[PDB]
Amino acid sequence: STLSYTLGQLAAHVGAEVRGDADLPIQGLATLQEAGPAQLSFLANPQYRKYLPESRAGAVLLTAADADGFAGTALVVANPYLAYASLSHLFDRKPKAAAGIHPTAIVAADAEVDPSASVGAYAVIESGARIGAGVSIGAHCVIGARSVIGEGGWLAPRVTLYHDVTIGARVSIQSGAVIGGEGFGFANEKGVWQKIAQIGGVTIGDDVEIGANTTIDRGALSDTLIGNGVKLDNQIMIAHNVQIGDHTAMAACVGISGSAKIGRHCMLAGGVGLVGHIEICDNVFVTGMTMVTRSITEPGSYSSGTAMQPAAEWKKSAARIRQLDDMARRLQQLEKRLAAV
Amino acid sequence: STLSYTLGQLAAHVGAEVRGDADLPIQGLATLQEAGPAQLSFLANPQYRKYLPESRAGAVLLTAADADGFAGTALVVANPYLAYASLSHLFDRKPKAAAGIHPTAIVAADAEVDPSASVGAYAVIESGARIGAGVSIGAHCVIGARSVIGEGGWLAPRVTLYHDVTIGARVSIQSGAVIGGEGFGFANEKGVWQKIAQIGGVTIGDDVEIGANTTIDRGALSDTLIGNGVKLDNQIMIAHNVQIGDHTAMAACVGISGSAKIGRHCMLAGGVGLVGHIEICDNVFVTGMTMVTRSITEPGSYSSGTAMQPAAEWKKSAARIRQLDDMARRLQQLEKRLAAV
Amino acid sequence: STLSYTLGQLAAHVGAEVRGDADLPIQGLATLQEAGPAQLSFLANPQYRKYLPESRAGAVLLTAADADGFAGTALVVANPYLAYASLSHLFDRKPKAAAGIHPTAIVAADAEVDPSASVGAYAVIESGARIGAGVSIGAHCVIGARSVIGEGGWLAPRVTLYHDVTIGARVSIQSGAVIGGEGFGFANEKGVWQKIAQIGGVTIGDDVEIGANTTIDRGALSDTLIGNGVKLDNQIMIAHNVQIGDHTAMAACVGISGSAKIGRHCMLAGGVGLVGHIEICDNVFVTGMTMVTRSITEPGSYSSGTAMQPAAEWKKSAARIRQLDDMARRLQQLEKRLAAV
Ligand SMILES: [Mg+2]
C-alpha cells in the first residue's frame, strides 16, 4: 500500500487555495516535465514556465500570477518551492525506527538514553553520553564518552562521534560522518613531526545537517564551533578550531583549514578550500573550486581559477601566463619607445 | 603453500602461444624491471622495451613483433596488457567467503538472501532487501529497506546502502562507500535553509565499480542513475540526480554536482569538478583538477587551471593576471597611437 | 575529578626552570588571550608577544629572552611550542581501553593478539593477522587476513585494513580510514574497462599518522609504501604503488595518483593533487590546491592556480587569459611596426 493524500490534505499542510477539486488523490511529487496525473508538481523557475500548459501533472503548486489562465488544478501559494519543500516530507519512504534499544546495542551503565530514543543494532554508546528525546541512532553508530545529542536528532547508520562532542537539537547526520577526530596537529623538531594532543571538543548548534563521509575535527584547546542552521554536504573536511556562523551552507568536497572563521549566511560552492587563520564576513559566496587565501571583509561573490578550454587551447593560455612578466616588461618598453618618437 | 601455475596453464587462460617450455612453474606477476625467474612479466608500453633483454622474468607476454629476436620464453598474444589484466585474477590472494549467513548477521524476515550468497559478521539486511546469487556481503555492511544487489556482486566490509538502492549484476564496492544518502537539498526562506526530503532512489547498472569512501546520493524525485560498466575510483562524490553513461570512468576525488549528465565512454581525471545541471557528450576527457562550468557538446580533452611554477614565479604570474584588463587597455591605446603617427 | 598537575610536575616533564612558585596547580592549557589563572600558556609566535603582559594565564612557557622583564611565573625552555606539544598529552581526556578482547570481538583461531592489546566491541580480526603489544583496536574495526599492527599502535573505532597490510610501530589511525583497498586498475578493451586484480599489499613504517576517512590503496604488483614518521591528515587519497618518504606531511584532501614517489621531509598543503608516475625530491613544499603535473628535482615551494578576486573582476581576468595568444601576437606585430618606423 503506497502513501496517498488528497489535494485538500496537501493544500491544508502548506496553506494553499485549491482551484479545482480538493478530493483528487496524489501518490507523489514530480517536476513539470516528468509528472503524471497521480502526481503534484510545482513551478518555481520562470525558465520552466514553457512546460506548464503541456505538463501531465494532476495539479501544480503556483503563484496567484501563474494560476491566472492555467487550465489544470492549481494549488495557489506565495512560494511554490517552499511548499514543495514542506510537502516532500509527506512522501518520504525512509524507514523510522520505533523507540527502544536494540538488544545488540552496548550502552554504558552511566550513559543516559531517553526512553523515546531509538538505538540500532551493534551501536556503542560510551560512558557519560546523553541521547535526548526522539533521537534515532542508526545501526553501527559509535557515540564517544560524554558526547551529547539533543532532542529530535537523526544519525544514519555508521556515524562516529569521538568523546566530548556536544550537539544541539534536530541534528541530521548521514552515514560515514566522523565528528571529533584528531586533526593534523604536529610540531616540527629538526624535520621530525611531534604530535600535539587535541584536547578541545566540538560544539554543534541546532538544526545542523552533516553529509556522508564528512569529517569535523575536535579543537586543539577550545572547541571547533558549528552554529545553528548550518548545512554541510558530503565529503567536507572541517579542521580543528574552525568556527562556522549560523545559517551558512557548504557544498560537497569543501575543505576548511584550521582556525578559519566563517560568518553567518555564507555559501561555499563545491570543492572550495580556505586556508587557515582567516576570517570571512557574513553574506559571502565563494564559487566552485576557489582557493580562499586571505580574509574577506566585504560581502559578495569571490572566485579563483581559469575558464575551461579545449586542452590544446588551455595549454597555449597556460604557456602565455608563464610569459606575463616578460609581456608586461615588453609593453612598458614599447610605451617608453612610442613616447620618445 | 603459494599459488602456482605452469606457463602452459597461464597461456591456455589468455590464448597465448608458448615459445619455450610450457612446464615452467610461475608464482606471480611483475613488471620487466622487478621480475625474477619465478614471475611472468609483460611488455605493454614501447617506453619499457629498453628493459626487455635484461629482465630476469621467467617469461614475458609479448606481441608476435616483440617476440622476434627475444632470447627468453615468450607468451605471444595480440594484447599483452589485456592478457596481464586477465591473469592477475589467478594470483589474487583476497579471501573468498563460503556461502552462508554469519550467525551475528541480522536479516529481516521479509528480506530474501540467495542461498549461494555470503553475509559477513555484524551485517544488517533490512525489510524487503534482495541479495542475488553468488553475492558476497562483507562484515558490518548495512543494506537498507527494499535495496537490491544483483548476482555476482562483491561488497567489502563496511559498505552502507540506504533504502531503495537498486544494483545490477557483478557490482564491486570497496569499504566505506555510502550509496543512497540524502544530498544537499535545501530551500532558502529569508536566510534560513529548509530541508527538501530526498524521495528518489539510486539505480546502478551491471559491472559497476565503486571505490573506497565514495558517496552516491539518492535522487530528489527520480533516481540517481549510474550506467553499465561505469568505474568510480575512491573519495568520489556523486550528487543527487546525476546520470552517468555506460563505460565512463572517474578517477579519485572527482565531485559531480546535482543533476549533471555525463555521456558514455567519458574519462574524468582526478579531482575534476562538474557544476550542476550541465551535460557532457560522449567521449570527453577532462584533465586533473579542472572545474567544468558549462555543457560540453564536442568530444575531446578539456582543461582549466594554470601551470605549476616555483612559488616566487607563480606569485608574479598571479599578480600579472589581475592586471590583464589594464594591460589589454594599454595594448589597445598603443595600437591606436602607432596607427595615428 | 579533573586532571591537575603542579607547575613543578609540568616543568620536570619538559626540563623547564620555574621562575616563580612550583606548587601552583594547573588544570589545563590555553593560548595567551584565552588563558585563565588555572591554565598554563606559551609564547611561540612573535606576533602574539603583544598579548603576553595582559594574559590571565597562571604561568607561561617562555624562552630565557621573553622571560626577562616578564612579571608572571615563567617556565623557561629552549622551545615553548615543543614543550606545549609534550605537555598537551598530560591533559588529554581520550578514553584508554584496558588490555583484553571484548566478548563480541571475532578473532580467527590463527590470528595472534598480544595479551597487552585491547580489542573493542564488534571488531573482526581475520586469519593470520598479528596485533602487537600495547595496541588498541577500536570498536567495529576490521583487520584483514595476514595484516600486521606493530607495538603501541592506536586504531580509532571503524578502521578497515584489507588483507596483506603491514604496519610498523606506534601507528595512529583515525575513524573511517580504509587501508589496502583496490584502487582504479582497469585495462580498456575497445571502450570496455577490464579489471586488473590488485595483488600487492601496503607497507607502513613506524610513527605514522593517518587521518579520518583517508584511503590508502594496495599495490597492483608490489606494495604501496609509506615511510617512517609520515603524517597524513583527513580525507586524503593515496593511490596504488605510491611511495612516501620519511617525515613527509600531507594536509587534508590531498590526492596522490598511482605510482607517484614523494621524497623525505616534503609538505603538501591542503587539496594538492599529484599526477601519476612523477617524482618529487626531498624538502619540497606545495601550496594549497596546486596541481603537480611533472617531477620536481629542485627543493623549495611550488604553486599553481590564480589569485582570488571578487567574482566580477575574476570573470574579466579569466576572459583576458583566453585572449593571451591574441595579445602576444598583437604585442609582436607592434614591436615589428615600431622597429620599422
Ligand atoms: Mg577534493
Numbering used by the authors:
A (entry chain A), B (entry chain A), C (entry chain A): 3 to 343
Give excerpts from the publication:
LpxA and LpxD are functionally and structurally similar, sharing a homotrimer architecture and conserved active site features, especially in the acyl-chain binding pockets that reside in the dimer interface of the β-helix trimer core. Herein we report the discovery of several small molecules that bind to both P. aeruginosa LpxA and LpxD with μM affinity, identified using a targeted structure-based methodology that utilizes molecular docking, surface plasmon resonance (SPR) bioanalysis, and high-resolution X-ray crystallography.
After failed attempts to crystallize untagged LpxD following protease cleavage, we tested several variations of this LpxD construct by first replacing the thrombin protease cleavage site with a TEV protease recognition sequence, and then excising the first two residues of the LpxD sequence, which are located immediately after the N-terminal 18-AA hexahistidine tag and protease site. The resulting construct led to protein crystals similar to the published one, with each asymmetric unit of the H3 space group containing one monomer that forms a biologically relevant homotrimer through 3-fold crystallographic symmetry operation. Importantly, in the apo structure of the new LpxD construct determined at 1.55 Å resolution, the density of the His-tag linker is no longer observed in the active site. In fact, whereas these residues are ordered in the previous structure, this entire region of the His-tag and protease site is disordered in the current structure. However, our failure to crystallize untagged LpxD suggests the His-tag may still contribute to the stability of the crystal-packing interface, despite the lack of an ordered conformation. An interesting observation in our new LpxD structure is a well-defined magnesium ion in the core of the trimer. This magnesium ion, likely from the crystallization buffer, coordinates six water molecules and appears to be critical to the stability of the crystal, as removing magnesium from the crystallization buffer or chelating the magnesium with EDTA eradicates X-ray diffraction by the crystal. Our new LpxD crystal structures also shed light on a previously uncharacterized magnesium ion at the center of the trimer core. We hypothesize that a magnesium ion can potentially stabilize the trimer.
